[PDB]
C-alpha cells in the first residue's frame, strides 16, 4: 500500500508532515517490496505492519529505542521494534534479554507478555534502522533504501522545539547519533540486546532509569515503562 498511497493516508498526521521529505523514497520501498514478492522472496513484517511505529503520534515521542532490522522468524515481527503480539511465546532471545534489564534496572517483575504497545502508547517511538526482512535472514534489507526514511524521522524529531532522548540499541542504530547533536537531544549507547552482543554491555546498562533521569533533567515527564 506505501507504492499506492500517500504517507496522508498510511500515518499518523504529525508523522505524515515529519516525513514529507521521503515521500517519494517511502514509494520507492513499496516498489522495491513489490519487486521482491514478483521474484519469489518474502519480507517481514507483513506490509500493513510496515510504518506502524509511525502511527502513533509524532507530537507525543519523548524517547525513542532504535534497534537494527525487524524478527527474522514469521510470526514476530509486528512494526514496533522488539515488540511482538499479546499470544507469541516463547519471547524472542533479544526479548527475553531486554526483560531481564528492565527488571533489573527499574525492580518491576517480568512483563505478561511480549506485547511493548504501552510503550507506543506512552510517547516511546519504536523503530528499527531498516523496516523490512527477509525471513531468516537478519540484516538481509541493510542498504536498499530504508536509511533515509530513518534518518528523516529522527531529524524531524530532533528540530522539534521539544526535549527527546535516544536509546540506541547496536552499530545501525548508533548510525543516528550525528543527527541529536542539538542541544535539545541525548543519546544513550550501548551494543545490541541480542544473544551475540548483549554481554558486550547491554546487561546492566539500566536504560529505562537513565532515560527518565535525562527527560526529569530537561523538564520533561518521565516514561512510565510499568508493562502489565
Known amino acids: 500500500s506505501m507504492t499506492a498511497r500517500p504517507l496522508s493516508e498510511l500515518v499518523e498526521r504529525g508523522w505524515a508532515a515529519a516525513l514529507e521529505p521521503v515521500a517519494d523514497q517511502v514509494a520507492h520501498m513499496g516498489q522495491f517490496l513489490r519487486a521482491e514478492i514478483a521474484a519469489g522472496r518474502r519480507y517481514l513484517p507483513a506490509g500493513s505492519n510496515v510504518l506502524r511505529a509511525f502511527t502513533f503520534p509524532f507530537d507525543n515521542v519523548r524517547v525513542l529505542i532504535v534497534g537494527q532490522d525487524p524478527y527474522p522468524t514469521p510470526g514476530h515481527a509486528v512494526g514496533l521494534s ?4 499479546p499470544d507469541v511465546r516463547p519471547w524472542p532471545r533479544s526479548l527475553a534479554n531486554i526483560f531481564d534489564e528492565y527488571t533489573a534496572d527499574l525492580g518491576y517483575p ?9 510503550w507506543a502508547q506512552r510517547g516511546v517511538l519504536l523503530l528499527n534502522r531498516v523496516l523490512t526482512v527477509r525471513p531468516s535472514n537478519p540484516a ?6 530504508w536509511e533515509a526514511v530513518t534518518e528523516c524521522a529522527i531529524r524531524a524529531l530532533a528540530a522539534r522545539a521539544a526535549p527527546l532522548v535516544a536509546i540506541l540499541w547496536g552499530r545501525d542504530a548508533s548510525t543516528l547519533k550525528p543527527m541529536l547533536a542539538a542541544g535539545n537531544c541525548v543519546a544513550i549507547e550501548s551494543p545490541h540486546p541480542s544473544p551475540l552482543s548483549a554481554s558486550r554491555g547491554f546487561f546492566g546498562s539500566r536504560p529505562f532509569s537513565r532515560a527518565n533521569e535525562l527527560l526529569v533533567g530537561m523538564g ?5 515503562w510499568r508493562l502489565p
Not at 110 to 118: A, F, H, I, Q, R
Not at 140 to 145: D, F, Q, T, V, Y
Not at 220 to 224: R, S, T
Request: aromatic letters at 4%; charged letters at 20%.
Open 110 to 118: 517480568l512483563p505478561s507478555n511480549g506485547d511493548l504497545t504501552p
Open 220 to 224: 520533561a515527564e518521565p516514561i512510565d
Open 140 to 145: 538481509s534489507h541493510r542498504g536498499k533504501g
Open 82 to 85: 522488539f515488540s511482538v503480539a
